[PDB]
Amino acid sequence: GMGKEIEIERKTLVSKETFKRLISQLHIGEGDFKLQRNHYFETDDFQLKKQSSALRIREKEAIFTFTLKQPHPAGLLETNQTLSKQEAKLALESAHFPSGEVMDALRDLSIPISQLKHIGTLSTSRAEISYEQGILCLDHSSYLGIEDYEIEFEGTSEEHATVTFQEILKTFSISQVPTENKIQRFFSKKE
Ligand SMILES: [Cl-]
């Protein structure tokens, strides 16, 4: 919707060689990959994690986006807000966030905004294609000295997303493995 959206997502990590094979078989060019930086925010005691939520500022092609992800009956509720470079920099450098729908949703979750701070940055090189009735993302990410590769399917219903993703794993012979979110893979490494 207009700032808010429901995220229905299926995901698995893959090897470097499998990722490289998928780029070839899906006929994805080098120029299709776009670079983005995810700057993560969290309290010392990890309050957003305890409420199954994630707060980031994304930087992509000179556009900054403030994003909260929180639990929702179906999938996760994603609340997006555009920021200027000024607002993004203030948040990153001095933990001063702008008023708006993201701030409102944080305060509705009883998150002390004065305790939030920039914990680190994960970079992702991403290619996206329309697959069936959804979107298929190829993510090569780097963070805290290491890197990894990931395929994800963005669906519209939980039922159809499962069917479509299981079809992708079978069709392209991808062996599925347990896969937590980028932000969780980030600070599980940080810990
Ligand atoms: Cl990267």
Query: 106 CA to middle of ligand 1, Å?
Result: 29
Q: CB–CB of 20/138 below 8 Å?
A: no
Q: How far is CA 161 from the centre of its chain?
A: 17
Elucidation method: X-ray
The three-state DSSP-derived secondary structure of 64-111 is EEEEEEEECCCCEEEEEEEECHHHHHHHHHHCCCCCCHHHHHHHHCCC
Q: CB–CB of 40/55 below 8 Å?
A: yes
- DSSP secondary structure, 129-173, as one string: EEETTEEEEEEEEEETTEEEEEEEEEESSHHHHHHHHHHHHHHTT
Query: 144 CA to middle of ligand 1, Å?
Result: 11
Query: 125 CA to middle of ligand 1, Å?
Result: 5
Q: CB–CB of 175/164 below 8 Å?
A: no
Query: 46 CA to middle of ligand 1, Å?
Result: 26
Domains parsed from the chain with CATH numbers: 1-191 (2.40.320.10)
Query: 111 CA to middle of ligand 1, Å?
Result: 31
Reported resolution in A? 2.1
Query: 140 CA to middle of ligand 1, Å?
Result: 6
Query: 93 CA to middle of ligand 1, Å?
Result: 23
Query: 124 CA to middle of ligand 1, Å?
Result: 5
> CA 139 → CA 23, 91, 122, 144, 181, distances in Å?
11, 26, 12, 16, 12
Q: What is the dihedral of CA 20, 62, 67, 177, to 10 degrees?
A: 10
What are phi and psi for residue 175, nearest 5 degrees? -85, 120
